[PDB]
Amino acid sequence: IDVSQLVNPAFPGTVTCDEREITVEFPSSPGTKKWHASVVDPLGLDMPNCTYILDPEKLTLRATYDNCTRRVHGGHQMTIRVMNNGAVMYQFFCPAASTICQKDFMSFSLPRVFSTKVQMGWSIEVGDGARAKTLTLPEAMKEGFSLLIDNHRMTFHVPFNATGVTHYVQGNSHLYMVSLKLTFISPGQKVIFSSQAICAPDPLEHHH
Ligand SMILES: *[C@@H]1O[C@H](CO)[C@@H](O)[C@H](O)[C@H]1NC(C)=O
Ligand SMILES: *[C@@H]1O[C@H](CO)[C@@H](O)[C@H](O)[C@H]1NC(C)=O
Ligand SMILES: *[C@@H]1O[C@H](CO)[C@@H](O)[C@H](O)[C@H]1NC(C)=O
Numbered sequence: 020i021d022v023s024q025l026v027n028p029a030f031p032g033t034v035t036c037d038e039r040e041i042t043v044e045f046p047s048s049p050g051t052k053k054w055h056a057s058v059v060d061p062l063g064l065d066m067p068n069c070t071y072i073l074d075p076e077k078l079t080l081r082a083t084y085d086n087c088t089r090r091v092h093g094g095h096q097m098t099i100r101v102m103n104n105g106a107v108m109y110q111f112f113c114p115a116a117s118t119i120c121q122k123d124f125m126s127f128s129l130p131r132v133f134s135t136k137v138q139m140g141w142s143i144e145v146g147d148g149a150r151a152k153t154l155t156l157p158e159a160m161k162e163g164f165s166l167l168i169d170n171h172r173m174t175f176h177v178p179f180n181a182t183g184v185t186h187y188v189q190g191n192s193h194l195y196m197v198s199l200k201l202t203f204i205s206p207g208q209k210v211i212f213s214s215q216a217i218c219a220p221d222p223l224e225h226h227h
Contacts, residue, residue, distance in 0.1 A: 036113035125218035138204040
């Protein structure tokens with residue numbers, strides 16, 4: 020008998036640990052159409068400042084890390100209560116650049132990792148809030164990213180004028196940044212971290 024499944028049951032759907040929020044994704048079923056869900060402390064008591072979003076069409080529950088989770092060793096823990104019309108509780112856990120500059124380019128190199136059936140993978144993202152991860156080679160090269168690939172590494176070369184490079188100016192200082200997402204995939208759980216490849220020039224050098 021596996022007692023750890025009696026005290027800590029496995030959620031029958033997916034969970035996503037985002038940079039700013041937790042998305043719990045329930046399995047689609049007519050029986051799950053008769054469920055209600057709420058965020059609770061390990062005793063089942065409502066957490067006071069926690070506000071969360073329910074989407075009945077996508078069957079998702081979204082909660083911020085602040086006020087909705089408890090800090091545990093290695094990261095954050097959240098508890099939800101699921102009720103019919105017998106009740107069940109589930110707990111979730113979320114854990115807490117080699118850039119090269121050039122006169123007209125920035126360059127960086129990233130591992131081709133791609134690997135208990137756990138996967139690790141990288142992706143390039145562009146835009147602010149509305150956009151998505153353009154990881155796919157057609158999209159990345161449509162944004163101007165030239166790519167060198169060997170058995171062990173992936174190396175990117177992008178001009179500063181490229182659409183995939185966000186450019187910031189605060190007075191005389193200039194900053195070039197490509198955002199990256201490191202994605203881990205496990206059965207029933209996705210975990211996403213954020214990262215950047217950043218190349219700031221010298222103001223005198225940038226002024227030419
Ligand atoms: C909830 O918000 C109130 C408002 O100031 C604050 O006093 C309290 O500490 C908060 N509780 C938390 C963050 O657990
Ligand atoms: C979360 O807790 C903080 C405590 O500093 C409070 O200021 C805030 O209003 C609470 N709610 C949200 C949605 O952040
Ligand atoms: C891209 O670089 C070329 C040559 O360096 C330049 O002519 C062009 O204006 C740049 N694109 C921009 C600044 O959008």
